[PDB]
Design a protein around this ligand. Structure first.
Ligand SMILES: [Ca+2]
Ligand SMILES: [Zn+2]
Length: 392
């Protein structure tokens, strides 16, 4: 039963948007309803973060921090100079100023949101040594995020997260197929990609790069520009962090805090072929993934990169092997759930038979009780002890 009053905060990956965007079609719930509202109605206070879908985990973490406590996004002077984007971004009121008073949160993160949540915890706790030294050397101001010593996060739950990257980015036409996927999610919200909507609809939040959809421009045309922009061509991107090498680099510094609980949920929607050893999309998998992504994921091997048969099972977008927690370039530990949730370690809650989009309701699946999944999750997080005691 209930051991903590920490609010829940929802977080998205390489696709996602605010509650007011997509004409109210929720990323968290999609065609099935409104997950945040379900939790609130059942007495679990729950909020939603919206950060750049295509931006690096770093950028997203800085935007999350500021969206949480209030203020103007500060990406870091060292970081901004290193990648050639703006240091300061959007300004936020702050969802939870209670955080600046000892309060804590549970983060439920989906897809690449799980990388972002991990990095947010690491910056909060440790800050950035490079940013601290840079401010010292150059006499610039320094965001509190980079100082260290914050403890906002009681737990982090990840769902279908590419902790070790996804081999989807190795597709030779990944660039086009990835934006086609963005178009498919627009399609899910009944939004056309060949129309210059004058209202914003889907804000990619690229204030650090000075990019936004222009009047007269459809998403199709907007995506053609973005493909050529630094948010697609630079290392300071979701594209890079999403790749196996990019994820591995992230894992080399983003460690599990000893003060935080970690829960991992994996997802699969495939079956194994007995003659090929490959994996193939199940019935019911979102159309786009089934045609465009899953066949590659379930068959792509690369010996020098360390991509072997274990990587083939997938949920249509991410390899299931990548989801239980960071392993490549990581010292984090991962323990299979045994009734007991342990602190400072990845508690691998196993693998669920739902695809990348079904798990948040963006694609339908009447066999998946989505309301009960999230309510069971919520009740699990509410039962977490903020301070466990050692015992026999
Ligand atoms: Ca489905
Ligand atoms: Zn950046």
């Amino acid at each position: 039963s209930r051991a903590n009053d920490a609010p829940i905060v929802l977080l998205h990956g390489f696709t996602g948007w605010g509650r007011e965007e997509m004409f109210g079609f929720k990323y968290w719930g999609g065609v099935r309803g409104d997950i945040e509202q379900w939790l609130n109605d059942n007495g679990y206070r729950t909020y939603t973060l919206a950060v750049g879908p295509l931006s690096s985990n770093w950028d997203r973490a800085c935007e999350a921090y500021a969206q949480l406590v209030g203020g103007t996004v500060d990406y870091g002077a060292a970081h901004a100079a290193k990648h050639g984007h703006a240091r300061f971004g959007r300004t936020y009121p702050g969802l939870l100023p209670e955080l600046k008073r000892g309060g804590r949160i549970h983060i439920i993160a989906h897809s690449q949101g799980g990388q972002t949540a991990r990095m947010l915890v690491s910056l909060l706790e440790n800050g950035s040594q490079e940013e601290r030294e840079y401010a010292k050397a150059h006499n610039v101001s320094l965001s509190p995020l980079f100082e260290g010593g914050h403890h906002f996060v009681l737990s982090v739950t990840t769902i279908a997260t590419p902790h070790d990257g996804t081999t989807l980015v190795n597709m030779v036409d990944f660039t086009d197929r990835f934006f086609d996927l963005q178009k498919a999610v627009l399609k899910a919200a009944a939004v056309a990609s060949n129309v210059p909507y004058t209202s914003q609809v889907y804000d990619f939040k690229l204030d650090q790069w000075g990019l936004r959809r222009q009047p007269g421009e459809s998403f199709d045309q907007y995506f053609e520009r973005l493909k050529r922009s630094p948010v697609w061509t630079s290392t300071d991107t979701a594209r890079y962090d999403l790749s196996v090498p990019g994820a591995e680099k992230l894992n080399q510094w983003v460690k599990a805090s000893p003060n935080t609980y970690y829960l991992s949920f994996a997802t699969e929607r495939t079956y194994r072929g007995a003659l090929t050893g490959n994996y193939y999309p199940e019935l019911g998998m979102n159309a786009f993934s089934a045609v465009v992504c899953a066949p590659f994921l379930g068959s792509y091997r690369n010996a020098t990169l360390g991509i072997d048969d274990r990587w083939l099972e997938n949920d249509g977008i991410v390899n299931a092997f990548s989801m239980n927690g960071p392993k490549r370039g990581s010292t984090d530990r991962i323990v299979p759930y045994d009734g007991t949730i342990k602190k400072g370690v990845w508690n691998d809650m196993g693998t669920y038979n739902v695809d990348h989009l079904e798990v948040i309701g963006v694609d339908p699946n009447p066999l998946f009780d989505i309301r009960a999944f999230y309510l069971r999750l919520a009740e699990q997080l509410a039962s977490l002890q903020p301070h466990h005691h050692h015992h026999h």
